[PDB]
Design a protein around this ligand. Structure first.
Ligand code: BCL
Ligand code: BCL
Ligand code: BCL
Ligand code: BCL
Ligand SMILES: CC[C@H]1c2cc3[nH]c4c(c3C)C(=O)[C@H](C(=O)OC)c4c3nc(cc4[nH]c(cc(n2)[C@@H]1C)c(C(C)=O)c4C)[C@@H](C)[C@@H]3CCC(=O)OC/C=C(\C)CCC[C@H](C)CCC[C@H](C)CCCC(C)C
Ligand SMILES: CC[C@H]1c2cc3[nH]c4c(c3C)C(=O)[C@H](C(=O)OC)c4c3nc(cc4[nH]c(cc(n2)[C@@H]1C)c(C(C)=O)c4C)[C@@H](C)[C@@H]3CCC(=O)OC/C=C(\C)CCC[C@H](C)CCC[C@H](C)CCCC(C)C
Ligand SMILES: COC1=C(OC)C(=O)C(C/C=C(\C)CC/C=C(\C)CC/C=C(\C)CC/C=C(\C)CC/C=C(\C)CC/C=C(\C)CC/C=C(\C)CC/C=C(\C)CC/C=C(\C)CCC=C(C)C)=C(C)C1=O
Ligand SMILES: COC1=C(OC)C(=O)C(C/C=C(\C)CC/C=C(\C)CC/C=C(\C)CC/C=C(\C)CC/C=C(\C)CC/C=C(\C)CC/C=C(\C)CC/C=C(\C)CC/C=C(\C)CCC=C(C)C)=C(C)C1=O
Ligand SMILES: COC(C)(C)C/C=C/C(C)=C/C=C/C(C)=C/C=C/C(C)=C/C=C\C=C(C)\C=C\C=C(/C)CC/C=C(\C)CCC=C(C)C
Ligand SMILES: CCCCCCCCCCCC[N+](C)(C)[O-]
Ligand SMILES: CCCCCCCCCCCC[N+](C)(C)[O-]
Ligand SMILES: CCCCCCCCCCCC[N+](C)(C)[O-]
Ligand SMILES: CCCCCCCCCCCC[N+](C)(C)[O-]
Ligand SMILES: [Fe+3]
Lengths: 281, 302, 240
């Protein structure tokens, strides 16, 4: 049940709540109060979802979907059959994600590391909450949230998108994308570099972080370095998600027309607005 | 408060690092360029040297040749007026030849020829850049991972512009050179193909792209969390595991019940990313060639 | 048809890739063990990969993983329960004993070397033409612990030559001897360096280095471990 170097770290302490009560593992998993919290919220989330399936008629996870309350409900509560379960499951979901994060913080404390991980996760949780809590509330109804089902959530995406034309024109959505693509470029390169040094040509000796800078400088004129690249991946990722949140929190709220049209501010600026020729003259 | 190691507090500079020399022809490295205090808060402050060479000179010349072919066409679309040029910069587009010209080069400079010229240039630019990715590694005696992984990105690019238009018997299936036009091409491609959300490869691509963000968020954060035990120093933690590698492995196994090595996290990393464009280019290449409607295909899968 | 053959091929490919990735990530820490160091019964469904061997640069030998796992060091902890899965209480001072968040590993007692086989890390005085280029130069600043008491004075920055980077602050104590403190665990301020992990009285306890112009990987581990463990193990002394 333990990695060969593990026991020296399995010492008491680091917990935020209930002191020694839940300070222990089950197999490889640390528990803690937040272990108990996430399990409770998770189980109740899944039982509500399982019960929701029965009301729908399927047990096929490719067909099961839980829809928010219809928009007439506004921000009120709904009947379980028609948005209630979702409303409760969302509370169990948020419960389980946030308990998972504070559990990670407890893991951090015991291990004496920085809290960067739970911090990072908090951004994912914030993107989730934007879609199901902040935007729906600013919009006056839970109906605007996405439904919990494998394909039906993709529907909500396509539908939500094409409410505003080609969503490509949302400018925050362009920033987010660029960060997602850039992150993935950076992930490929970073993996491949370290691997290319740890796994040199047959018979040769492992290279060195000097080789890693040398290679990249040779190649593009700059090397960010090994602290840098991990600051970078973290930043690209969190930015990608920061801007995903941003590009939906404004959609439906401050902007609700066709996004292509937002770009008219630019084309119509009075110093070139009426000049003939080009695509807009 | 407690320092997080997202920015450096103190910067330190020595003599310019001109770098290692293994089989590298030094006659072709530039000199070091300026140092940047700004960059030094985050990564390295040194710029250069770059290794120009024949493939460097080759790629860069074509790169620019491609970029000016499009920009000349834009300037022309602006009727030579720089007001209009700034103004409509994303509405301009260098569009491939019409369907009627198939895979020929029969068509005027305007109306397709300029697109082809610019594409040819892009082709030599990228492939030569690719070879430079391999050769630079070999010179230092390092692995060809960067080249194998860059190839996966090349795949998707090749598929969109070259393999798929060839397999559909026409260049007009290829992507135009414009900021807004190429987004329109994207949206139109999905509409004309039954909605790509129904392409299983397209969804796989998304899981890897979302997963790339998840993973690099995870990894970077983890390495910053264990930077107080020398974590960034990953190649020495491979050669000689330290408590940084152990604390990291155990954060994750106590969190989700399994973990990685300081070497193997980078195999997860390179693969997660590389499978974005891999699966992605399959999905595109199959579209209009084998499957005309992803919805339809989904219904039976035949 | 071709497309549905392609998707079926892929899920098979991906199962093999996950298999490969998980065995690759089993070249450290396996086999799994019980709390008394013996081989555990269930090891999971993945086997151990065939060994691979890194050739280390500077005559510094080879690493074959997997291989004989062994802490090569005493571990001062006792069980607190009659069954698995519970915490193991330090038997002495966990800071001194090097357990818990004060843990260190028995790395090679030699300094990490650079690409030319020169010591990668040096005090700035031995580091040819290296100077602070931006930020507050900490050299000369008094060091405060979390008990808001001064533990010493900064006397130098220990730098990474290849990566041009401050790695440690070397610190002179009331008795003239010095210690390294990791840069990552200090706050450089206009008029002071502040260290929350540790209280003034715990600075003497920081593990020393055998030689004044190099640090070994074993010593780095002992130092970083120690000062990190103070976040848990000084706590009653910390105050604000
Ligand atoms: C994948 C399916 C579509 C597609 C869908 C989308 C969508 C959707 C979006 C983009 C976006 C971008 N796309 Mg596109 N994109 C495709 C293929 C390409 C190719 C190519 C040669 O195959 C290129 C060069 C680009 C280029 C770009 C950039 C303009 C922009 C940010 C990319 C990025 O982060 O790069 C990674 C980071 C790097 C540092 C690499 C270099 C980045 C620069 C900017 C490259 C392009 C600059 C170009 C040569 C010159 C621009 C003109 C001047 C500004 C005047 N795309 C295919 C055809 N692309 C985003 C955008 O903001 O559009 C307006 C966006 O929202
Ligand atoms: C027709 C559709 C429209 C469109 C409409 C929309 C809409 C609508 C949305 C996006 C959003 C996004 N789009 Mg757009 N988009 C289009 C075309 C594109 C293209 C493209 C190539 O053309 C790209 C690259 C993108 C890119 C993106 C991303 C920037 C962003 C999604 C990531 C995200 O939010 O993560 C954030 C991550 C999360 C929310 C994950 C949360 C994870 C939680 C915290 C943990 C879960 C635990 C869970 C229970 C699992 C348990 C595991 C157990 C072990 C089992 N779009 C087209 C034109 N797009 C979305 C966005 O920005 O949302 C904020 C959004 O809402
Ligand atoms: C981000 C913007 C949109 C959105 C747009 C899209 C688009 C577009 C696509 C997906 C796709 C997926 N999305 Mg989605 N998706 C959104 C929000 C979510 C949330 C959430 C709680 O916020 C979850 C859990 C998911 C989950 C999923 C997966 C079922 C599938 C592959 C994703 C993946 O690997 O991601 C990255 C994460 C990992 C690699 C780690 C593991 C994640 C696992 C697989 C999550 C499984 C969840 C499970 C099936 C359902 C809950 C289980 C409970 C215990 C009951 N999405 C928001 C609303 N999503 C793709 C698909 O291919 O088919 C539907 C796809 O094309
Ligand atoms: C309305 C639009 C359609 C749609 C249409 C398409 C189409 C069409 C395509 C994608 C593709 C992708 N889409 Mg989709 N997509 C939609 C909805 C989504 C949503 C969402 C939230 O709804 C998401 C998250 C995505 C996500 C994705 C990605 C997983 C995938 C692109 C991977 C990548 O990195 O490409 C970017 C990477 C590259 C383009 C490779 C570039 C490498 C080259 C060699 C480098 C060029 C350098 C050049 C010389 C310039 C030099 C610059 C200077 C040096 C700086 N789509 C909707 C349903 N999508 C692509 C794919 O693979 O689909 C299966 C694709 O073709
Ligand atoms: C901020 C940048 C990126 C990021 C970071 C990130 N994610 C993280 C972390 C971090 C740093 C963790 O530490 C944590 C982890 O353990 O990772 C392995 C996590 C995590 N990210 C996860 C998934 C995930 N992350 C995503 C995204 C991202 N995560 C970003 C791209 C996505 C996307 C893109 O869609 C997904 C699907 C999990 C693997 C893990 C968190 C596990 C967790 O929260 O467990 C507690 C809850 C349960 C075990 C299940 C209970 C669920 C509910 C009660 C019921 C189900 C409701 C749900 C809404 C239904 C979903 C239906 C869908 C089909 C729509
Ligand atoms: C696995 C998929 C991911 C991936 C991986 C990947 N990409 C890679 C690699 C890898 C492993 C490389 O090794 C290679 C590289 O060099 O990285 C640094 C590369 C690369 N990925 C690149 C871009 C790129 N990657 C993308 C995507 C992705 N790459 C995926 C997410 C995208 C997207 C999303 O569109 C882009 C745009 C390039 C930076 C680089 C390959 C460079 C190349 O082939 O260049 C040809 C050279 C030229 C064209 C010369 C420059 C031309 C410029 C247009 C001129 C400069 C413009 C300037 C604004 C004007 C100057 C005026 C003058 C008068 C001075
Ligand atoms: C051992 O490890 C490692 C090292 O150490 C030795 C290393 O050195 C390195 C080396 C690393 C490098 C050399 C650097 C890598 C850098 C990148 C991959 C990219 C960095 C990019 C940024 C920091 C900025 C990104 C900017 C983005 C994403 C903005 C998007 C751009 C656009 C043009 C937007 C599109 C257009 C418009 C008009 C936007 C819409 C307008 C409005 C919203 C207004 C690696 C990889 C490594 O692994
Ligand atoms: C160098 O450093 C590093 C490491 O190590 C040296 C690492 O390992 C990692 C970790 C990364 C990997 C191992 C790579 C593989 C990971 C991914 C591709 C990310 C996605 C992960 C998953 C999809 C699996 C997620 C599974 C989860 C979240 C839950 C597991 C299953 C359960 C049933 C949960 C059980 C726990 C509960 C209920 C809480 C309390 C327990 C009770 C019993 C009650 C990173 C990032 C790193 O940088
Ligand atoms: C002159 O003006 C100044 C100085 C101001 C410069 C300004 C220039 C400007 C404004 C440049 C603008 C450039 C833009 C907007 C570029 C954007 C391009 C985009 C978004 C491209 C996106 C995707 C391209 C793809 C997918 C192309 C793939 C191409 C191939 C795989 C190559 C295909 C090759 C072919 C068809 C040729 C084969 C023929 C032979 C004979 C081998
Ligand atoms: C609300 C979404 C429902 C969650 C269902 C969880 C079970 C996941 C099984 C996915 C496998 C699909 N299938 C049936 C083809 O094997
Ligand atoms: C190397 C990383 C492995 C992670 C793979 C994640 C699997 C996600 C499944 C996506 C579902 C695809 N789809 C739409 C065809 O069903
Ligand atoms: C990629 C889709 C799969 C979703 C992840 C669900 C299971 C992963 C967790 C396995 C950990 C179990 N254990 C005992 C090995 O720790
Ligand atoms: C694609 C997400 C990752 C899922 C694949 C990993 C499965 C769990 C690994 C089990 C090995 C852990 N253990 C405890 C047996 O050593
Ligand atoms: Fe790394």
């Amino acid at each position: 049940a333990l990695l060969s170097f593990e026991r020296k770290y399995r010492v008491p302490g680091g917990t935020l709540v209930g002191g020694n009560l839940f300070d222990f593992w089950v197999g490889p998993f640390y528990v803690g109060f937040f272990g108990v919290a996430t399990f409770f919220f998770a189980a109740l989330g899944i039982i509500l979802i399982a019960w929701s399936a029965v009301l729908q008629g399927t047990w096929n996870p490719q067909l099961i979907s839980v829809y928010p309350p219809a928009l007439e409900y506004g921000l009120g509560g709904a009947p379980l059959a028609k948005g209630g379960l979702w409303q409760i499951i969302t509370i169990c979901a948020t419960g389980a994600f946030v308990s998972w994060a504070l559990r990670e913080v407890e893991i951090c404390r015991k291990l004496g590391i920085g809290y960067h991980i739970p911090f990072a996760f908090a951004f994912a949780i914030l993107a989730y909450l934007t879609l199901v809590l902040f935007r729906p509330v600013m919009m006056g109804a839970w109906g605007y949230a996405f439904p919990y089902g494998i394909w039906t959530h993709l529907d909500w995406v396509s539908n939500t998108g094409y409410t505003y034309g080609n969503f490509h024109y949302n400018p925050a959505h362009m920033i987010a994308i660029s960060f997602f693509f850039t992150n993935a470029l950076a992930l490929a390169l970073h993996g491949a570099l370290v691997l290319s040094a740890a796994n040199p040509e047959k018979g040769k000796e492992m290279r060195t972080p000097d080789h890693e800078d040398t290679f990249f400088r040779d190649l593009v004129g700059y090397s960010i370095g090994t602290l840098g690249i991990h600051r970078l991946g973290l930043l690209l990722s969190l930015s990608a998600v920061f801007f995903s949140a941003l590009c939906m929190i404004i959609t439906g709220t401050i902007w609700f027309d066709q996004w292509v049209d937002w770009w008219q501010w630019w084309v119509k600026l009075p110093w070139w607005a009426n000049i003939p020729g080009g695509i807009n003259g | 408060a407690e320092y997080q190691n997202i920015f450096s507090q103190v910067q330190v500079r020595g003599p310019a690092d001109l770098g290692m020399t293994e089989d590298v022809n030094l006659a072709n490295r530039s000199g070091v360029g300026p140092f940047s205090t700004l960059l030094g808060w985050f990564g390295n402050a040194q710029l250069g040297p770059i290794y120009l060479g024949s493939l460097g000179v080759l790629s860069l010349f074509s790169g620019l040749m491609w970029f000016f072919t499009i920009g000349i066409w834009f300037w022309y679309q602006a009727g030579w007026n720089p007001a209009v040029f700034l103004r409509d910069l994303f509405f301009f587009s260098l569009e491939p030849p019409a369907p009627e010209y198939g895979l020929s080069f029969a068509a005027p400079l305007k109306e397709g020829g300029l697109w082809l010229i610019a594409s040819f240039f892009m082709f030599v630019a990228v492939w030569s850049w690719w070879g430079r990715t391999y050769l630079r590694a070999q010179a230092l005696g390092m692995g060809k991972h960067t080249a194998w992984a860059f190839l996966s990105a090349i795949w998707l690019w090749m598929v969109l512009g070259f393999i798929r238009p060839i397999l559909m018997g026409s260049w007009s299936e290829a992507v135009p050179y414009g900021i807004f036009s190429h987004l329109d091409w994207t949206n139109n491609f999905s509409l004309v193909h039954g909605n790509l959300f129904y392409n299983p490869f397209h969804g796989l691509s998304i899981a890897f792209l979302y997963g790339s963000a998840l993973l690099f968020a995870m990894h970077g954060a983890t390495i910053l969390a264990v930077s107080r035990f020398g974590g960034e120093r990953e190649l020495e933690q491979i050669a000689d595991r330290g408590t940084a590698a152990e604390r990291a492995a155990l954060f994750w196994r106590w969190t989700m019940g399994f973990n990685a090595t300081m070497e193997g996290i980078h195999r997860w990393a390179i693969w997660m990313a590389v499978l974005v464009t891999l699966t992605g280019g399959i999905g595109i290449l199959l579209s209009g060639t084998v499957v005309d409607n992803w919805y339809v295909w989904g219904q039976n899968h035949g | 048809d071709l497309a549905s053959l392609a998707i079926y091929s892929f899920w098979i490919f991906l199962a093999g890739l996950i298999y490969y990735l998980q065995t690759e990530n089993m070249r450290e820490g396996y086999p799994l063990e019980n709390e008394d160091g013996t081989p555990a019964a269930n090891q999971g469904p993945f086997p151990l990969p065939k060994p691979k061997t890194f050739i280390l640069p500077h005559g510094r030998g080879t690493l074959t993983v997997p291989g004989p796992e062994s802490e090569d060091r005493p571990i001062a902890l006792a069980r607190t329960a009659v069954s698995e899965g519970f915490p193991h209480a330090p038997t002495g001072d966990p800071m001194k004993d090097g357990v818990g968040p004060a843990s260190w590993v028995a790395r090679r007692d030699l300094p990490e070397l650079d690409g030319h086989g020169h010591n990668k890390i040096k005090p700035m005085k031995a580091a040819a033409g290296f100077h602070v280029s931006a930020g507050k130069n900490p050299i000369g600043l008094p060091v405060r612990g979390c008990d808001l008491e001064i533990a010493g004075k900064v006397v130098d920055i220990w730098v990474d030559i290849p990566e041009q980077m401050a790695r440690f602050l070397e610190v002179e104590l009331k008795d003239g001897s010095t210690r390294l403190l990791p840069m990552q665990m200090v706050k450089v301020q206009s008029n002071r360096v502040h260290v929350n992990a540790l209280s003034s009285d715990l600075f003497a306890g920081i593990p020393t280095i055998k030689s004044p112009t190099e640090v070994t990987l074993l010593e780095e581990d002992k130092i970083c471990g120690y000062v990190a463990g103070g976040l848990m193990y000084a706590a009653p002394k910390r105050k604000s």
